[PDB]
Amino acid sequence: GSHSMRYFYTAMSRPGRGEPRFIAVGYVDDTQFVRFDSDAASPRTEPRAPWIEQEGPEYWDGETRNMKASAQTYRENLRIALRYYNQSEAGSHIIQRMYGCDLGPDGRLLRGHDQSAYDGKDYIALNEDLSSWTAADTAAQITQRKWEAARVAEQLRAYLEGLCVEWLRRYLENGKETLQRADPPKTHVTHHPISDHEATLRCWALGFYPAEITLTWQRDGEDQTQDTELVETRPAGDRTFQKWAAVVVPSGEEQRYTCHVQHEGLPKPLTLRWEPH
Amino acid sequence: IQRTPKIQVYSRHPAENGKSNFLNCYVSGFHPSDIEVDLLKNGERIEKVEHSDLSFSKDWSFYLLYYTEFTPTEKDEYACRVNHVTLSQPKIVKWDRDM
Amino acid sequence: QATQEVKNW
């Protein structure tokens, strides 16, 4: 339907164990297509999806050049963060950044993102207007002033407006056969007794793409939100995802429950019940 | 500042004994990044296991998937074992075909 | 394609 591209950077310090480590991944929708690891024997921006491999020498040199610079830049940001927070050089800390572009179904730029975090909490984010920043604490304000002073926001907006949208349209074309096809889930309901009096019903969704899905348990048409146990949508390893929801029900009540599945691949949501044979 | 990982042990395709499959361990929602995961058969680690590149979710917690090629058997019991700064002891999650 | 940084915190 609507498509997006995101980049994820992670920087970790390892005091006394080696240099800080930098890892970058790129995705289009839920499909990872590139990787960089500063710890690789010979660090390189490598393909992780087949359709990206067509990209030329200028491209691959360009991104390896870029990612190695970024790793240096975040090694220094990690040091700077120590000043702002007055933290010791013995601790291990983590900086993260996620940024990308959303394209509306229409295909023009619909939204742009940039968010950064320190030790897993919000640090600074590019606002929706792509011109201003939101600082999480007084330390991030120090960065905020430097960045409006250096007009970074104008530079990242130039990226998301243009180069991000342009490559992501190019990728969507190259990866047409996988990126632009929705795989509906395969669904079935499972039963396991806990005891003679109670059993667990579990609703399964398998082999779907994209990852976005909703699973719901209802009893006599009313939501068992509070009593449903949900697991995080998980990768199958073949680029499709899985999920399940389960409830513990009194024996003999199994057919009052119905499992409802919503997925972009589905024409109409599915309603499932336990069917033993 | 620290979030413990959520572990799932599952197979790529529904299990049928003697038919080749993939064994997945997916760990998610954890912070910091330093984590170790091994896949176990009868309590001993499988030699060749690969993992996805590190990435994170909207709430900044990380996720990885550890996988290996395998063939399930009636006899054998498989598991996933995870170590993290939040775990007092390595936590072992046994594979259940039902989940 | 990724974004060139090169801003420092």
Residue numbers in the entry:
A (entry chain A): 1 to 277
B (entry chain B): 1 to 99
C (entry chain E): 1 to 9
Can I see the authors' text?
The most interesting feature of these three QW9/HLA-B*5801 complex structures is that the conformation of the middle portion of the bound peptide appears varied, even between the two independent molecules in the same crystal structure. Note that in Fig. D and E, the densities of QW9-E5D-1 and QW9-S3T-1 are too weak to assign the long floppy side chain of K7. But their main chain conformations are in convex shape, indicating that the flexible side chain of K7 should point outwards. The mutation S3T is somewhat complicated. First of all, the replacement of S3 to T3 does not noticeably change the location the hydroxyl group, as shown in Fig. 1B. Comparing QW9wt/HLA-B*5801 with QW9-S3T/HLA-B*5801, this “extra” methyl group does not seem to affect the overall conformation of QW9/HLA-B*5801. In other words, from a structural point of view, this “extra” methyl group in S3T mutation does not seem to affect peptide presentation. To sum up, we may have provided a structural rationale as to why the naturally occurring E5D and S3T mutations would not be expected to significantly alter presentation and recognition of epitope QW9 presented by HLA-B*5801.
